[model samples]
Target chain A: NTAVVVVLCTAPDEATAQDLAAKVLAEKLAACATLIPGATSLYYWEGKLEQEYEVQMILKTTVSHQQALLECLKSHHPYQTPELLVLPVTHGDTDYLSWLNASL
Target chain B: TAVVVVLCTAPDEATAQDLAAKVLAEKLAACATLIPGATSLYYWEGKLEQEYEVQMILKTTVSHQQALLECLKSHHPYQTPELLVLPVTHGDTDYLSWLNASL
Candidate 1:
C-alpha cells in the first residue's frame, strides 16, 4: 500500500535521538528521521505539569513498519515512558514518497 | 475522535510564536509546538526555492480546524500558506484528555 504514517517521538537529548534514529534506519524500520532540536515540552507527569527541554524526532515510515518501529523505539528510548504518536500522512511529495518506499 | 494536528510554516520566529500564542489564547487549538528554525525546500511558481522557515504544529480537534486555518491564514505572511492536517491515530491517553479539556 502507498498509505504512509509518521511517528513522532521526544527524546532527552540530541545524542539519544541520533542513536535511536541510526538504529531504526539501519534496521530498515524507518525511512527517515528528522530531529527537531531545542524543543521545550510541557505536560502532566506524576500528577503535576512539568516542563523539560526535549528534542523531537519525526520518523518517516509506512503502515507496514509502524508496529515494529514502535517496538524498536520502546527498546531504545531512554524515558521510562516516552511520548510517541502515530500521525497518518494523507499526502506527501511524490518524489519523497518514492524515495521513502525504496529506502525502506 | 476530533483530535487533529496542523502543520504550518512561517517566515520567521517572531511571526510563528506570535500567531501560536494568539490562536491558543483564542482557544482555536489546544496546544501548539513551535520549531523556530526550519529550512523548507520545494518548488514554487515553477522554480525550485530554498527558504528559512519556522514550523509549528497545532493540536486541536476536527471541529476547530477550519476556524484555526482561517485565523492562521489571515495572519500568515505567505501569499498561500502551507497548512496540512494530520490525524492522530494514537498517543498518550492522559495527554489526549488534557488536550481535549484545554480546548
Candidate 2:
C-alpha cells in the first residue's frame, strides 16, 4: 500500500517535466516521477474559452514527505497557483512498496 | 491550461474505462485519455468508503464537463454520481490549446 502521493505539474515542454522529476528523485522525496506528454486541456479562464498543450507530471512519494515536497514545488514552480492534488494510494503490491520504502 | 472534465467511476474498472473512453471520444468531449490506477475511496447507497481502486484521466474542453457528467451518470451502473471537477491552473501552451481545438 502507498502512504500518500501528491500529483500535479505543468510542463512548458518535455524537459521541464524531466527536470522536475529528476530533482524530486534526486532529493529522495520521490520513488518515481512520471512525465506524460501530448495532453490537451480545456478550461474556462478570465471569461474566455482557453486551451493549451501541456505535459502532466505525476509524483510518487511517501506521506511523510508532503510538507517539504509541497514547499519544494511552490518555491520552484512557474505558476502562481500550481495544481497539487494529494491522493492516498490505498493498496498495492507488497514487493513494490518494499522497494519504495528501501529507496526512501 | 486544460478545460474541466469530471471523472470518477465504480468497480467494473476495465469496462468502465472502455465505456467512458468511447463516450468521450465519440461525443468529442475529450481529445485524449489518461487512466491513473489505485484510486481508493468511493461512496454509494447510504454508505461511504468503498475502496474500489480505479483510474482517472481526461483532456477535454471545460464546457463539456457537465455534459460528460450527464453522459457518465446515464452510462454508469450506480444510482448516484461520482463526478469530481478540478480546475487546472496552468500548463503547456501547445497541449492545452490542441485539446480545446480537438473537442
Candidate 3:
C-alpha cells in the first residue's frame, strides 16, 4: 500500500506559517501545504486553560518523509515545543493521491 | 485506543462552523478547528476545478470515528463529502488527555 500522511502543525501567525510552508515545500519534504489562518487554539499550559490565535498548517506527504518533515518544521518553527502531530491517511481519491505523490 | 483527526471540508465558513458546532455539542468530537479561505484544487469530471472552501479538522478517537463520520455526512450539504480519518501517531500527553476527557 502506498501510505500517505498528514502532518498537523501550528504557527504563531500567517507570515511565519507561510514561510515554514515554503521552506518545507522547497525541500521536497512535503507535497503540499494547506494553511488555515485565523484558528483559535485552546489548551492547558501549566495547568491553566489558555487560548491563542494561530494558523493551522496541514502538510501532505508520505510515511517515508514524515520524520524529515517533522524535523524541518521543528527547526524552522519559533515555538520551543510546537504542536507537531502526524495522522495517517487511510484513503483518498486516486487522482488526488496520484497528484500528491507526483508533486513530491 | 489512539486519537484520530478527521479531515473534512465545507463550502463556506458558515456551513463549516455549523457542522463543527453540531458535532461538538453532541459529544461526537472534542474539538473542531475551522480554517477559512482555502483554495482546493481537484479534478471533477475530467477537468481541473478550483474553489474556495473551508477546511474543518475534528479531533476524536478510534472508538467514536464511525458515529462521528455518520453524523457529519448526514448533515453535510454535499452528497459525498470529504470524510477521511487520519490516525494520530503521537501527541502531547496533556493535550491528548484533554481531548479524551472532552468527549
Isolated chain B TM-score per model: 0.91, 0.71, 0.94
Task: List, residue by residue over B53-98, the lDDT tens digit for candidate 1.
Answer: 7778889887788788888877887655766567777789999888
Q: What DockQ does every candidate get?
A: 0.11, 0.03, 0.21
Chain A agreement with the truth for model 3, given as TM-score:
0.92
- Per-residue alpha-carbon lDDT of model 3 for A34-92, expressed as tens digits? 77777899998899898999988888888888999999999999998999998779655
Clashes of 3: 0
By lDDT: ranked, best first? 3, 1, 2
List ranges where model 2 is wrong by over 4 Å. B1-103
Clashes of each: 0, 18, 0
- Tens digits of per-residue lDDT, candidate 2, B1-103, equal 2465444545556666775677667664654354543333212233323233344555555566656666666676655434545466676788787777766
The sequence of per-residue lDDT tens digits that candidate 3 reaches over residues B1-103 is: 5898888889999999989999999898999998788754444454444567888889998888888888898899986676777778899999999999988
Per-candidate fnat, comma-separated: 0.12, 0.00, 0.31
State which candidate has the highest TM-score. Answer: 3
Q: What is the C-alpha RMSD of each candidate to the true structure, in Å?
A: 7.7, 13.4, 6.9
Q: What is the TM-score of each candidate against the true structure?
A: 0.55, 0.49, 0.59
Q: How close is candidate 2 to the true structure, as a TM-score?
A: 0.49
